[PDB]
Design a protein around this ligand. Structure first.
Ligand code: OIY
Lengths: 44, 78, 60
RNA sequence: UUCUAACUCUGUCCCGUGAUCCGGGACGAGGACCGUGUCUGGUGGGUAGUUUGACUGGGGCGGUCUCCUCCUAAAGAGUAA
RNA sequence: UUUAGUUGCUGGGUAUAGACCCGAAACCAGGCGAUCUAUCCAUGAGCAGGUUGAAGGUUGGGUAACACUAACUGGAGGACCGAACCCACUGUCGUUGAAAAGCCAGGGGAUGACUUGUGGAUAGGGGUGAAAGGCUAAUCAAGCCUGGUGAUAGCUGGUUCU
RNA sequence: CUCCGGGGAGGCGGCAAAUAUCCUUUGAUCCGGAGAUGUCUGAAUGGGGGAACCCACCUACUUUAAGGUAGGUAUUGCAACAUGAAUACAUAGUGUUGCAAGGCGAACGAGGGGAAGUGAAACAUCUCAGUACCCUUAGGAAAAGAAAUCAAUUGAGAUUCC
């Protein structure tokens, strides 16, 4: 049966990517929180 | 880019509705804002201002030229 | 407003009389078109001290 | 009843301008109306916060909830359903 | 008219604080989700084979002329049978499964209100719904995450040497 | 990598031993100060974009082939200069040059908005509480501050904190 995750790299980058995060203030807050926590990878 | 009087700086303020049972809910009071064209003789043109009726009274009392000069001094494009 | 007329008006007066009108009348018709000037002390002094002779001079 | 000058136009023309936005100008049709601010009466499950008792031979339905008199009450007082 | 208080230190009790510890269903604020699914938008793709014979057209009989009538053409349909494809009506099996929804044997639609790829739009008292309170990432009579927050619990449990 | 100063026999960073080539009393390794270099992404600023990629233009020098070197090319605000509609004067608009700003980051400050769980043994006034949270913006602190203030024998004498 079809499962929920159907991968597509273009859609992944356009929804959760670096420029998508930078495009809004809430995404920039997400990036700030992840930098403060010290994540090794900021985005997908 | 807002509900701000150009002459007085008036803007909406918050308050309460108070019912007969004393329930309180937030509201705003808005200024009596509108657009108005004023003849400027020194510049031979109409200037369109967003202002309140109190600002209109101030213009009545002080003359349009003085008010326009004051706004330009505060840094407005009139 | 209190205004000083710069010309003849049918029911108001003529040629320098000070008369109280409704604010809209002064603001939107008389003052912008030059038929009157707001009766400030400076305006009254400037009108009466000098210019009044030519204002009277213009008959029509 | 009439008017224009505040104000309206998701009507025409001109310019910014390579532009069905916007701004300025000229017209036309309206016009002290419409519309907006403050105050105010009405309507208002559209939406929101809540309330909707207890006893009880389970609960509900019925009955009862305070006071006075007699019996139960066992010859002082008090004594439950 | 009662005629020993007061300031420290230690201990018992009370009050305000989470106040002995663990436990809700909830309520509020800000963010994250339409790679599943619902509807829509743009641009592409798919439907073996076989039937039936609508409208229309031509010719021929027949009338005073119409009427009427036969044959041949023509190829319509939310048309018919039936693979791919899309569904899910019945039964056995499976139920610590091969599988967190299946297999097998039958079953329905199959040129249409059809199926489908890629890329987009709609975001939580909101969306979408040929309408079942259905669906909104194995979660839905109000999604998920983080905060208020150690919510409150007249309730249940537990509470350690002589 | 360079210079200045220190130091005086070892050294070629660690996991991580061995190995080779080696360096060093003509002063190494090492320590301190000052310089040189400093790819690409990122406010990212020549345009674009799915971050670390794609595509450019203009000057000056250089090369003969299909290139190299250096510089410039974002937006907004202010100033100067130039240019310049409807429309005559103007104004709007346009361009060049110069200067400035944007982004990040603990807590504390100032300002703009602002809950509910909870308590009241129910609950609506009230409480929680101007708390949590969202937004804007400084400084080493910020804010406030020199009485149209208090007091009530006519006295005190600006703010801030205990
Ligand atoms: N955007 C806002 C839109 C406004 C809108 N136009 C409505 C409007 O215009 N005014 C609203 C009133 C604003 C006011 N601040 C509310 C207030 O102060 N309440 C007081 C409540 C007291 C107490 N907590 C409860 C109470 O005893 N209540 C009673 C009574 O229960 C109520 O009856 C209802 N309730 O059922 C009503 C009779 O009808 O009388 C109330 N008592 C009183 N009523 C009078 C009053 O208001 N003033 C004067 C004096 O007379 C007052 N005493």
């Amino acid at each position: 049966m079809k499962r929920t995750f159907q991968p597509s790299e273009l859609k992944r980058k356009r929804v959760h990517g670096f420029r998508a995060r930078m495009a809004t203030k809430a995404g920039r807050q997400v990036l700030a929180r992840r930098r403060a926590k010290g994540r090794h990878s900021l985005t997908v | 880019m807002s509900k701000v009087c150009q002459v007085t700086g008036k803007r909406p303020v918050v308050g309460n509705n108070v019912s007969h049972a004393n329930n309180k809910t937030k509201r705003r009071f808005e200024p009596n804002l509108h657009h108005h064209r004023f003849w400027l003789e020194s510049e031979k043109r109409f200037v369109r201002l967003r202002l309140t009726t109190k600002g209109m009274r101030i213009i009545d009392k002080l003359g349009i030229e003085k008010v326009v000069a004051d706004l330009r001094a505060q840094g407005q494009k009139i | 407003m209190d205004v000083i007329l710069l010309q003849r008006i049918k029911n108001l007066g003529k040629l320098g009389d000070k008369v109280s009108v409704k604010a809209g009348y002064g603001r939107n018709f008389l003052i912008p078109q030059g038929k009157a000037v707001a009766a400030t002390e400076a305006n009254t002094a400037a009108f009466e001290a000098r210019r009044a002779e030519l204002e009277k001079q213009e008959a029509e």
